């Protein structure tokens, strides 16, 4: 018999993104080639099958630095990290291939699905 | 020119609640009288003006235990912690006074607003 506040989840995500922009309570650095991205492990786990597996590992859960596979493009990762914290995906003709490849590696099934759909249309 | 995934924020919150139920990456214990509640500092901050102030404090940000004011009712806190992680509020005739008082202390303005509305109706 609960009542529900429709905007609650969106407002929570908006505040988590504000914490990220201000580097508040970030507990991990994701290294992608020469580029570094600060984030919250819980948000990464909630969005990605790969980060979920990494941070549930009894040894990796305690690492402050995670290095991604050298094939991963920093821009594709940046676009996906922004999507994790906002629900908004900056999908463009020039980045769609790098975004799909990064989403497949990160195990972000809904992003992979829209990339396959957008590629099929063209 | 971004696209948006409508269910993303709700899915993120659902996964954060799953992490909470399994006690994964919880980094704080909230003590309410004899009762203890494990949670994620970032989720508490995203939902509550009080926790936002506590965990942005250069000294309190590093505490693993936070003791609430002894006037705070553990059931009211439990109902509000559940709302933080689900968007669902278990508001009942028998708990509405304790829920409103706890939401005022935690600075959860939308919960305070619906409690005032529900009290006014009766």
């Amino acid at each position: 018999s609960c009542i529900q506040f429709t905007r609650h989840a969106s407002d929570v995500l908006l505040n988590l993104n504000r914490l990220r922009s201000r580097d508040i309570l970030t507990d991990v650095v994701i290294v992608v080639s020469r580029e570094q991205f600060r984030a919250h492990k819980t948000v990464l786990m909630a969005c990605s099958g790969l980060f979920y597996s990494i941070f549930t590992d009894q040894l990796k859960c305690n690492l402050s630095v995670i290095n991604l596979d050298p094939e991963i493009n920093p821009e594709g990762f940046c676009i996906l990290l922004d999507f994790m914290y906002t629900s908004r995906l900056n999908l463009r003709e020039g980045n769609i291939m790098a975004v799909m490849a990064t989403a497949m590696y990160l195990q972000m099934e809904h992003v992979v699905d829209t990339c396959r759909k957008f590629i099929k249309a063209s | 020119s971004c696209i948006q995934f409508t269910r993303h924020a709700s899915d993120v919150l659902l996964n954060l609640n799953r992490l909470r139920s399994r006690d994964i990456l919880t980094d704080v214990v909230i003590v309410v009288s004899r009762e203890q509640f494990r949670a994620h500092k970032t989720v508490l901050m995203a939902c509550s003006g009080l926790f936002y102030s506590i965990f942005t404090d250069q000294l309190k940000c590093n505490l693993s235990v936070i003791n609430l004011d002894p006037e705070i009712n553990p059931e009211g806190f439990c109902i509000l912690l559940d709302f933080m992680y689900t968007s669902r509020l278990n508001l009942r005739e028998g708990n509405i006074m304790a829920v409103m008082a706890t939401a005022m202390y935690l600075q959860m303005e939308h919960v305070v607003d619906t409690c005032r509305k529900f009290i006014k109706a009766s």
């Binding site: 609960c2 009542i3 529900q4 506040f5 429709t6 | 669902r88 509020l89 619906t114």
Partner: peptide
């Protein structure tokens, strides 16, 4: 607020 809604009835979910």
């Amino acid at each position: 607020w809604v009835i979910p």
